[PDB]
Structure formats: structure tokens, C-alpha cells
Design a protein around this ligand. Sequence first.
Ligand SMILES: *C(=O)CCCCCCCCC
Length: 13
Amino acid sequence: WXDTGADXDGXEW
Ligand SMILES: *C(=O)CCCCCCCCC
């Protein structure tokens, strides 16, 4: 996906 913590459309990672 891409993210890490706060924020997104599900989290975590
Ligand atoms: C989230 O990004 C997990 C999937 C791995 C990245 C795929 C992006 C396109 C690959 C060329």
C-alpha cells in the first residue's frame, strides 16, 4: 500500500 501510522483507509503498518 504505502502508509505507516496515522492516516489512511484502514491502517496500521
Ligand atoms: C503496497 O504498496 C504493497 C504492494 C507493493 C507495491 C506495488 C507497487 C507497484 C509495483 C511495481
